[PDB]
Design an enzyme around this catalytic site. Structure first.
Site, PDB file in Angstrom:
ATOM      1  N   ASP A  34       7.604   3.044  -5.345  1.00  0.00           N
ATOM      2  CA  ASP A  34       8.265   3.097  -4.054  1.00  0.00           C
ATOM      3  C   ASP A  34       8.355   1.683  -3.501  1.00  0.00           C
ATOM      4  OD1 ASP A  34       8.954   4.331  -1.375  1.00  0.00           O
ATOM      5  OD2 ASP A  34       7.074   3.263  -0.900  1.00  0.00           O
ATOM      6  N   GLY A  40       0.827  -1.221   0.000  1.00  0.00           N
ATOM      7  CA  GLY A  40       0.000   0.000   0.000  1.00  0.00           C
ATOM      8  C   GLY A  40       0.847   1.252   0.000  1.00  0.00           C
ATOM      9  N   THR A  41       1.806   1.370  -0.924  1.00  0.00           N
ATOM     10  CA  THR A  41       2.652   2.574  -1.074  1.00  0.00           C
ATOM     11  C   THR A  41       2.408   3.083  -2.480  1.00  0.00           C
ATOM     12  OG1 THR A  41       4.841   2.307  -1.961  1.00  0.00           O
ATOM     13  CG2 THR A  41       4.305   0.920  -0.066  1.00  0.00           C
ATOM     14  N   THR A  42       3.164   4.062  -2.985  1.00  0.00           N
ATOM     15  CA  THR A  42       2.857   4.731  -4.273  1.00  0.00           C
ATOM     16  C   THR A  42       3.405   4.041  -5.508  1.00  0.00           C
ATOM     17  OG1 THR A  42       2.763   6.871  -5.254  1.00  0.00           O
ATOM     18  CG2 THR A  42       4.891   6.261  -4.309  1.00  0.00           C
TER      19      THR A  42
END
Lengths: 232, 87, 146, 179, 242, 214, 247, 233, 189, 235
Positions: free
Chosen positions: F45, F28-30
């Site tokens: 990321d 759940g990062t970019t």
């Protein structure tokens, strides 16, 4: 049509002799077994007369390979009946089921009929009438007091027609055994090593006979026959 | 109590082929569904082989399944029982 | 939130091409309405293969089959008719209309039959108080306003 | 209403109830729980183990019937709400010459045990058995340890459980006992 | 023997039923020709309506499968119409599965793989037809692919099919031996049609009217079949050229 | 067959009785896809591995459940290799997109993949994004994952017609850093005439003992 | 319609139909393979339906996995259907379970199983093609297999199938040795196909492919050093004409 | 499939195994020997990188094949999968007879349905279990099976059984059974000589170091050793 | 405590690997299983632990028969991940950990997994259990890269001794394997 | 399923079942299609209201068949299903040419597999749609083409010879009333070779002017006018 059902009966004539007779209080299934070859494993040679449930037993003449499939099917149905109806199968129902699967393989085309005829024997649960039945490759089945299938079956059917009476069945297991051993000896012209016999008695007493118990019946029969030839 | 998706994926292949055979009825008439049903009968009827777990290769040339695979092909999940079920 | 309306040269209208001259405008689930538009596009390509270019009433008819399980605006043009708009409100119910919206009587309050392009383009920009598509005999046109 | 109890000794297993099924002439299954779903499961297991014992002329080992009952129970819970069940399988292995006891819990968790129980029989029985038990017990010491344990329950549960049934498996097969 | 009634090998390793399906491709007495231009591909077929009772606007063997692809069929008209409706459906199915228009080569492979099922199964007959597929493919350009009752397929520089295919093929080969190009050098489809008609006339010896020909053209945009008036513009052009 | 439902209800009974269900890992990062003058670029990321290959020229960045993003991308990467071999034509991004859209729609958003798809094929450069329910989106610059509002504010503020490679890689790197309140960035660069370039980490006696064997 | 089972045993215990499929194989255009210390060569002739055919459009030598390739003698339609099922089995059975492409031997047991099932099923004939499967595996090394219409597979050092097979295998037995390199094996393969090619002998009438070194150039991406890319390479038409010029 | 007094298609499948190499199984008081001859070899066949005749079914069970090797591998994978299903279910290795009866049950089914030809193979099952110890079995295309002390299948079966009947002693050790297997093969095979490239060998031995069975399939160097020890050279 | 939910630890040294776990927490059930030279530890439910042993034993025994070699650690890591992704809906309640040495390179390699099979590789150590948050801090404090086999045994066993609470005997009862190119030794603590 | 000539044996035997069939003809006019059928009488028992040989498909298409009666009824039933299912779906009457492909594909489908048999019937059908008048003949092979006029059953050769003379003399095309008269001439002349049995004549027509583009049987004045035409020409 003829083009397999008559010819499956011919394959049943090639297979080893199987005999059964009712007593007053028991039924004995006897069978011829082919002579074990010099390098054969005797300690695992299969029993020829096959238990379906603790009260029910099947002997056959015909193809060994086909017989093993009918015997497995009879074993799974007897247990599926107990599991769903909470009662030991009747000998008539088990015969009805074996005769039914032989008939399904006769009508349908694509499959061939089973090259095996079976003697089915036992006692119904909680009962004392001995029951003995035949199935044909045709799916026809019938009650019998005394019957024989396989090689030379008509020389045993002659012997039984002369010795066995429906209204004086052998009253004791030992007479019943002697009568089927005497009959078996007619087709098994070797000794007491080619005969296999199993006795069913009420409340799940099923007993196979050892070669020594068989040899003392054959010893009695031989010395009674010799008394009746020591006499003119 | 069962998973919301379970019923839908139990019968996805049959649903999608039924929907497609309805479109071939609508566009091309009863001939196209009937011809394709009849080919699938020959291919499921013949080839009966009670050890051949994979399904047919020619059945992949009728379903349009040469380069299209999915989890039912990755995770696929008695001879006399199969004889009688076929007949 | 979505609109379609007829005018002199055709129709002015989450916009998707089910055929070159037949377009769909979508509301509710973007997953389910795109699965429907992809199957309608497959069906109209299959009809075109066998009968030549479809009528817009056929496209609305094809949408009924696929929306029967779970409304949408259908609009387009053909070489005989003026441009047309259809709607399938709550499923099973069907209409053929000079204009449609989904998400008000304010529309019919100002609407006028056989408007020019410029009147209708201003009418939709006022009534949405962003992307717009214009279908005509001459061709397909794209617009945007914000 | 519910108790299973079992204890393993030098050359026997003792099982106690109150039901139970003789799976094979040298094996017993004792069970407790949801009274509809556990009785059906015991009869399904009894039919299959009787079938193997007909189709092979042969006793299936206590390990194999226990693991079979543990593998049937896991299948039953797939595509079902898990029913409350507990199973003790006790038998005599004639190839190793040993009494063997396995417990299988309602998820198919199988453990081999010197002693075990399920039902209202909380840590009181286990505290008694922990201080008393020895691996080298005779069957007589075994039965009397059961009688101490039954007496702890009979104190602790005054709504009397109408007399237990007890059965012993050893070298000769099942016996039902008259205490 | 029994080997001939179902698709099974004879003692020669031959599939007699496939050889009998090939003889159905000669049954109609029609010759067809396809050639590639610089930016189009062009198919010429003989049309033979012998008895006055026919409606000649219903006697056609050129089938348009998609927007950009069509085919000519050699062999019986019922089996040709069966082959055409599968090709229509499987080009639209490919567009739904992969989101780009069915390329000609892949349609020929797909139909040749189906023809292999009927060239092995004993409860399905082969179709009596040879299928020639034509398009301007956006990667490979001008394309001709030919599929036959055995499930074989290949791409061609030019092709002929019918009873008299060796004469037309000999003239085509001798033309590409003259120019050393893979194609007809003309930059519009009218001049490619006039070449193909001149080669069909030179090879088959008969002159054609508008009533004796059927013609199809594939371009970037579309595949289309020529009206009898547009074939008259082409035959007037051959009569204006000499 | 297929993805088994078998221990559903039993696992719900276990969770209701307080045996805690282990938690599936989420990336759940970019993630971003910065297209450029001659091709498209994608970047992720990598914290708490996350660029996936559909084909040599078709790549994904994933968000949502980690196992699902890898399972769907490796399944479609296997259906697209078979279509490439079957047709003899280099695989197309629009084919990948269709196969992903139809698969995520089959599993109704219970397969938790949020997925940027980028590549080059004989038709040009392409950039798309798929949400777990099967929704497709398209554009010149795309972002998904927790920092995607900050990334799109950076992307829309600096994107330009015909960014060079250097400007696209720097933009994608900056847009990912704007997803941070350093971390390393994985990026790959798909330029129309050339092999795809993957730039990894571009943002640089107290107890008794017995005796036994096994 | 029943009792339509084909492939039935003749009185001599021979399957009959398989012998007829091996006669269809024996009339197919020659293909051969050779194993070296550092690779395998697989080679075949292309025969034109007309000189108007584009012989670029029908490849005989076919990639099954990045490390395994095939060639045939017999019916082309049958081989084209086997090869796409063989590619599908490599993904479904092996890649999607183990993350790796299958060994040559396993992909040779899966192809053989498709051909076996057609020899014990009703209403299908045997496949009229004798496929060939030479691949590469980390543990077993380089390998070459022949698979027949019977669904039986054999590992070979060097072999030949089709029209010229007995004269080709005579020559491969005279030429093969345990010290061969891949550039030696290609010279033997080209010399051997020169004996069956009654047509013209060019890089346009020969197909030739090799499994040898890894080719990072043919991988199509860079920066993942775990992957090293295809062992399978098909020689371009001028690479064959370069070798035939020195021959 | 229209059986007259006999089932023709099964008669013809038994003619098929009589052309197809030769395989021998000899039981001993301590273990079991399996030995087989590969059919005539071309030089270019890769004989160190195969098993032609002898296949492992689990750690305690092996087969020697005569007849069609394509048919064999369908049954062999089925027996492998059945042996592991029994181990998964009962947590014990499968009894040899249950594996033999299952494969004999499938081989009878391909003799009863009109769509299927019978499998052209006859196996020799060597193995060990706790019910009977060492067991040696044979199965036919007909789906019938029997236990033996010393059996041969394939070409020249009657000549091999003639030699086994006079040389076999019940209390032979495995090393006597190696010599008998080799003696039988060199008197039986249609060859000028016998060499290590034509043989396959396996044994199942208990061992005085363990209570548990060891299975060996012989590598080509070990076959050369037993050929020079046994004076065959 | 009950049989479910205990700890497993794996650690890479120079040409060696350790895998180790809690033994009984009362007064016999192991969670480390071996398929030749590849070791699988499983924290989780005791029913899923034993279901997964029986499932991986089956799949690995067939692999050895089909390929004629034991399964390498990386190939087993892909097999456990694909075999746990069947059951994406209602998964096994486990945290598998794998340890072994690849026979070709002879290089230590380890991985962890979740209910669905997502892979954590590490060049260091891997942990699984309900209480891994304490023990990960201990391993990170103790772990030196490139340890010899006997030092590596003391490093992983001191990690277990520091996180196993003082409530029973010899620190606590634990199993440790030292896995090495041609040797394995099992130590009970 | 194939022969050395490349032809289906069973379709070659199915056309022998049609060579024996009861005669029918069709004529295409400038604006419609006219059909005429032999209705042979073997017994007076035959009920006239119950006796019909021209069948109606969709109420706008006319259909007449020769060959096996079970198979001819099975095609007419399937024709009604196909014409009805088009009308439910595209909201327009099915086109005559579009209705010739759906029916031809159904007949062809039965020539493919040995587990089914070819249709033992030839069908002449046609009508008026959006574009105009179309006439078709569909054979046991699935072969079909458009026609200006067609004939089938026993009289087919005598009927073809007269049909060719119609098109030779009237190349401008002919109107429906003169075609009804000439249809009666063709069918009475086609009874030259079966003269020793009695036959009734049944006519129907479908014309843009004379029936407003819907199928009608011909009865009353036009029917008797046509009988009087045919009988004066033949004597």
């Amino acid at each position: 049509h003829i083009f397999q059902v008559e010819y499956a009966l011919e394959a049943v004539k090639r297979g080893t002799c199987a005999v059964g007779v009712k007593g007053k209080n028991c039924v004995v299934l006897g069978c011829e077994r082919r002579s074990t070859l010099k390098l054969q494993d005797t300690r695992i040679t299969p029993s020829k007369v096959s238990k379906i449930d603790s009260h029910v037993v099947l002997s056959f003449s015909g193809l060994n390979a086909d017989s093993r499939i009918l015997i497995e099917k009879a074993r799974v149905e007897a247990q599926s009946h107990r599991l769903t109806l909470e009662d030991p199968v009747t000998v008539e129902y088990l015969t009805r089921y074996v005769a039914g699967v032989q008939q399904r393989y006769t009508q349908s085309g694509g499959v061939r009929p089973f090259g095996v005829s079976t003697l089915i024997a036992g006692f119904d649960p909680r009962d004392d009438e001995p029951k003995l039945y035949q199935t044909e490759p045709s799916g026809i089945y019938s009650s019998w007091s005394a019957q024989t299938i396989g090689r030379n079956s008509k020389t045993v059917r002659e012997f039984l027609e002369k010795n066995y009476d429906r209204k004086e069945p052998p009253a004791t297991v030992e007479e019943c055994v002697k009568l089927t051993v005497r009959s078996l000896l007619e087709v098994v012209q070797t000794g007491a090593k080619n005969i296999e016999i199993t006795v069913v008695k009420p409340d799940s007493d099923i007993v196979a006979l050892s070669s020594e118990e068989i040899n003392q019946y054959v010893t009695q029969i031989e010395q009674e026959k010799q008394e009746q030839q020591e006499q003119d | 109590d069962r998973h919301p998706l379970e019923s839908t994926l139990k019968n996805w292949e049959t649903t999608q082929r039924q929907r497609q055979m309805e479109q071939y009825r609508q566009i091309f008439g009863i001939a196209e569904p009937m011809k394709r049903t009849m080919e699938m009968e020959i291919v499921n009827r013949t080839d009966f082989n009670p050890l051949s777990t994979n399904g047919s290769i020619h059945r992949d040339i009728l379903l349009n399944k040469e380069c299209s695979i999915d989890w039912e092909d990755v995770y696929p999940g008695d001879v006399h029982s199969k004889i009688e079920k076929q007949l | 939130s979505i609109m379609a309306v007829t005018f002199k040269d055709g129709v002015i209208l989450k916009l998707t091409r089910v055929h070159d001259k037949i377009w769909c405008c979508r509301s509710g689930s973007a997953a389910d309405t795109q699965a429907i538009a992809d199957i309608v596009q497959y069906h109209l390509e299959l009809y075109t293969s066998q009968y030549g270019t479809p009528s817009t009433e056929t496209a609305a008819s094809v949408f009924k089959e696929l929306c029967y399980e779970n409304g949408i605006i259908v609009a387009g043009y053909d070489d005989k008719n003026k441009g047309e708009v259809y709607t399938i409100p709550l499923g099973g119910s069907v209409h053929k209309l000079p204009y449609a919206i989904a998400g008000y009587g304010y529309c019919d309050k100002n609407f006028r039959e056989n408007m020019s392009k410029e009147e209708t383009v201003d009418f939709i920009k006022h009534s949405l108080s962003i992307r717009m598509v214009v279908l005509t005999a001459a061709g397909v046109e794209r617009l945007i306003f914000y | 209403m519910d108790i299973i109890l079992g204890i393993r000794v030098q050359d026997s297993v003792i099982l106690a109830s109150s039901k139970t099924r003789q799976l094979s002439p040298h094996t017993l299954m004792s069970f407790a729980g949801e009274a509809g779903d556990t009785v059906q499961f015991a009869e399904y297991i009894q039919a299959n183990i009787q079938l193997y014992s007909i189709r092979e002329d042969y006793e299936l080992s206590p390990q194999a019937v226990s693991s079979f009952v543990r593998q049937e129970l896991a299948k039953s819970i797939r595509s079902r709400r898990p029913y409350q069940v507990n199973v003790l399988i006790g038998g005599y292995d004639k190839k190793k010459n040993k009494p063997e006891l396995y417990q299988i819990d309602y998820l198919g968790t199988k453990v081999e045990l010197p002693y075990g129980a399920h039902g209202y029989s909380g840590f009181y029985t286990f505290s008694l058995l922990d201080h008393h038990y020895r691996p080298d017990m005779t069957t007589e010491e075994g039965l009397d340890l059961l009688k101490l344990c039954v007496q702890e329950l009979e104190k602790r549960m005054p709504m009397d459980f109408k007399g237990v049934i007890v059965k012993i498996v050893d070298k000769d097969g099942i016996r039902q006992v008259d205490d | 023997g029994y080997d001939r009634h179902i698709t099974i090998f004879s003692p020669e390793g031959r599939l007699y039923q496939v050889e009998y399906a090939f003889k159905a491709t000669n049954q109609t007495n029609i010759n067809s020709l396809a050639v590639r231009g610089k930016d189009c591909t062009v198919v010429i077929s003989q049309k033979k309506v012998p008895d006055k009772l026919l409606d000649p606007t219903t006697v056609s063997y050129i089938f348009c499968i998609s927007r950009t692809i069509g085919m000519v069929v050699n062999g019986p008209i019922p089996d040709a119409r069966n082959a055409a409706l599968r090709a229509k459906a499987e080009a639209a199915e490919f567009r739904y599965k992969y989101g780009y228009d069915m390329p000609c080569d892949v349609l020929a492979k797909r139909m040749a793989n189906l023809s292999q099922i009927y060239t092995q199964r004993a409860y399905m007959r082969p179709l009596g037809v040879i299928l020639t597929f034509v398009s301007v493919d956006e990667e490979l350009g001008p394309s001709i692919y030919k599929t036959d009752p055995a499930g074989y397929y290949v791409g061609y520089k030019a092709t002929a099919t019918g009873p008299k295919q060796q004469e037309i093929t000999t003239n085509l080969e001798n033309h590409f031996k003259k120019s050393k190009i893979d194609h007809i050098n003309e930059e519009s489809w009218e001049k490619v049609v006039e070449f193909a008609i001149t080669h069909m006339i030179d090879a088959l010896g008969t002159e054609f009217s508008k009533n004796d020909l059927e013609v199809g053209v594939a371009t970037k945009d579309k595949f289309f079949t020529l009206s009898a008036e547009n074939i008259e513009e082409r035959l007037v052009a051959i009569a204006e050229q000499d | 067959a297929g993805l088994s439902f078998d221990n559903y209800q039993r696992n719900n009974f276990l969770a209701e009785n307080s045996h805690t269900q282990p938690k599936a890992t989420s990336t759940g990062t970019t993630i971003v896809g910065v297209k450029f003058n001659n091709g498209v670029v994608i970047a992720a990321d990598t914290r708490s591995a996350k660029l996936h290959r559909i084909s040599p020229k078709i790549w994904c960045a994933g968000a949502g459940t980690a196992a699902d993003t890898e399972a769907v991308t490796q399944l479609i990467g296997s259906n697209i290799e078979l279509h490439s071999l079957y047709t003899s034509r280099e695989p197309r991004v629009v084919s990948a997109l269709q196969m992903l859209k139809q698969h995520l729609f089959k599993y109704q958003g219970h397969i938790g993949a949020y997925l940027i798809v980028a590549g080059v094929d004989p038709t040009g450069s392409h950039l798309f994004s798929i949400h777990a329910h099967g929704s497709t989106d398209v554009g010149y610059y795309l972002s998904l994952g927790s920092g995607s509002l900050a990334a799109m504010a950076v992307l829309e503020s600096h994107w330009k017609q015909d960014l060079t490679k250097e400007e696209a890689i720097k933009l994608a790197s900056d847009a990912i850093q704007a997803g941070i309140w350093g971390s390393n960035v994985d990026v790959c660069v798909m330029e129309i005439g050339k092999d795809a370039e993957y730039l990894r980490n571009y943002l640089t006696t107290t107890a008794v003992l017995k005796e036994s064997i096994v | 319609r029943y009792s339509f089972s084909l492939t039935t045993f003749s009185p001599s215990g021979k399957l009959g139909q398989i012998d007829y499929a091996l006669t269809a194989v024996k009339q197919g255009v020659t293909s051969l393979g050779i194993k070296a210390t550092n690779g395998v060569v697989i080679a075949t002739e292309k025969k034109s339906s007309s000189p108007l055919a584009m012989s670029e459009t029908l490849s005989k030598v076919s990639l099954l996995t990045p490390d395994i390739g095939a060639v045939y003698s017999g019916m082309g339609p049958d081989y084209r259907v086997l090869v796409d099922k063989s590619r599908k089995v490599a993904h479904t059975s092996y890649k999607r379970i183990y993350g790796e492409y299958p060994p040559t031997k396993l992909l040779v047991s899966e192809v053989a199983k498709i051909m076996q099932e057609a020899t014990q099923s009703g209403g299908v004939r045997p496949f009229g093609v004798s496929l060939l499967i030479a691949g590469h595996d980390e543990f077993n090394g380089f390998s070459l297999y022949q698979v027949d219409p019977s669904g039986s597979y054999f590992p070979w050092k060097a072999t030949a199938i089709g029209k010229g097979s007995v004269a080709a295998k005579t020559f491969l037995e005279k030429r093969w040795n345990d010290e061969l390199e891949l550039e030696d094996a290609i010279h033997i393969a080209l010399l051997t196909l020169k004996e069956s090619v009654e047509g013209e002998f060019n890089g346009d009438t020969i197909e030739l492919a090799i499994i040898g070194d890894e080719n990072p150039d043919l991988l199509g991406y860079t920066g993942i050093p775990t992957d090293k890319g295809p062992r399978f390479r098909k020689l371009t038409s001028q690479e064959i004409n370069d070798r035939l010029e020195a021959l | 499939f229209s059986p007259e007094g006999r089932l023709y298609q099964v008669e013809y499948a038994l003619e098929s195994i009589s052309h197809a190499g030769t395989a021998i199984g000899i039981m001993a008081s301590d273990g079991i020997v399996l030995a087989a001859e590969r059919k005539v070899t071309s030089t270019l066949l890769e004989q160190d990188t195969s098993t032609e005749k002898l296949y492992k079914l689990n750690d305690k069970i092996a087969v020697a094949v005569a007849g069609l090797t394509a048919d064999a591998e369908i049954l062999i994978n089925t027996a492998r999968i059945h042996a592991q299903n029994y181990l998964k279910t009962y947590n014990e290795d499968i009894p040899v007879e249950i594996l033999v009866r299952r494969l004999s049950d499938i081989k009878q089914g391909y003799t009863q349905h009109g769509g299927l030809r019978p499998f052209g193979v006859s196996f020799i099952y060597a193995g060990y279990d706790d019910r009977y110890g060492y067991q040696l079995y044979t199965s036919n295309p007909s789906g019938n099976y029997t236990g033996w002390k010393a059996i041969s299948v394939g070409a020249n079966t009657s000549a091999a059984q003639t030699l086994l009947q006079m040389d076999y002693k019940d209390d032979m050790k495995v090393d006597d059974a190696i010599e008998l297997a080799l003696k039988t093969l060199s008197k039986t095979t249609d060859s000028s000589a016998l060499t290590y490239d034509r043989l396959e060998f396996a044994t199942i031995r208990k061992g005085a170091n363990d209570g548990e069975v060891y299975q060996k399939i012989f590598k080509p160097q070990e076959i050369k050793d037993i050929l020079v020890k046994t004076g065959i050279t | 405590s009950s049989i479910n939910g205990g700890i497993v630890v794996a650690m890479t040294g120079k040409d060696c690997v350790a895998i180790a776990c809690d033994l009984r927490l009362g007064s016999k059930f192991e969670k480390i299983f071996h398929y030749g030279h590849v070791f699988l530890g499983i924290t989780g439910l005791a029913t899923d632990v034993t279901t997964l042993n029986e499932m991986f034993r089956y799949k690995t025994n067939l692999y050895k028969l089909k390929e004629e070699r034991a399964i390498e650690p990386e190939t087993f890591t892909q097999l456990v991940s694909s075999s746990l992704y069947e059951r994406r809906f209602g998964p096994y309640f486990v945290g598998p950990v794998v340890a072994g040495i690849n026979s070709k390179s002879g290089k230590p390699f380890i991985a962890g997994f979740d209910l669905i099979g997502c892979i954590d590789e590490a060049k260091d150590f891997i942990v699984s259990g309900t209480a891994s948050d304490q023990l990960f801090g201990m391993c990170e404090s103790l772990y030196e890269p490139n340890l010899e086999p006997e030092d590596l045994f003391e490093t992983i066993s001191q990690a277990l001794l520091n996180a196993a609470d003082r409530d029973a005997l010899s620190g606590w009862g634990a199993v440790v394997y030292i896995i090495k190119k041609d040797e394995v030794v099992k130590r009970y603590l | 399923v194939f022969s050395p000539d490349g032809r289906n044996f069973q379709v070659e035997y199915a056309v022998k079942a049609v060579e024996n069939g009861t005669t029918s003809i069709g004529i295409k006019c400038n604006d419609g299609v006219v059909f005429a059928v032999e209705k042979l009488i073997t017994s007076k028992l035959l009920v006239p209201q119950k006796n019909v040989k021209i069948q109606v498909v969709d109420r706008h298409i006319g259909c007449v068949y020769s060959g096996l009666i079970p198979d001819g009824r099975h095609l007419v039933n399937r024709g009604r299903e196909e014409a009805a299912s088009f009308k439910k779906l595209y909201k327009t009457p099915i086109p005559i040419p579009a209705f010739a492909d759906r029916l031809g594909q159904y007949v062809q489908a039965h020539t493919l597999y040995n587990s089914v048999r070819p249709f033992g019937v030839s069908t002449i059908f046609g009508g008026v749609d959006k574009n105009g008048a179309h006439l078709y003949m569909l054979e046991p092979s699935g072969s079909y083409w458009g026609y200006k006029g067609a004939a089938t059953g026993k009289g087919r050769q005598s009927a073809k010879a007269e049909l060719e003379k119609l098109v030779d003399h009237h190349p401008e095309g002919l109107s429906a009333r003169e075609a009804v008269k000439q249809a009666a001439k063709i069918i009475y002349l086609a009874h030259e070779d079966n003269k020793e049995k009695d036959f009734e004549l049944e006519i129907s027509w479908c014309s843009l002017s004379e029936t407003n583009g819907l199928h009608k049987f011909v009865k009353g004045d036009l029917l008797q006018e046509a009988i009087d035409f045919a009988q004066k020409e033949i004597n």
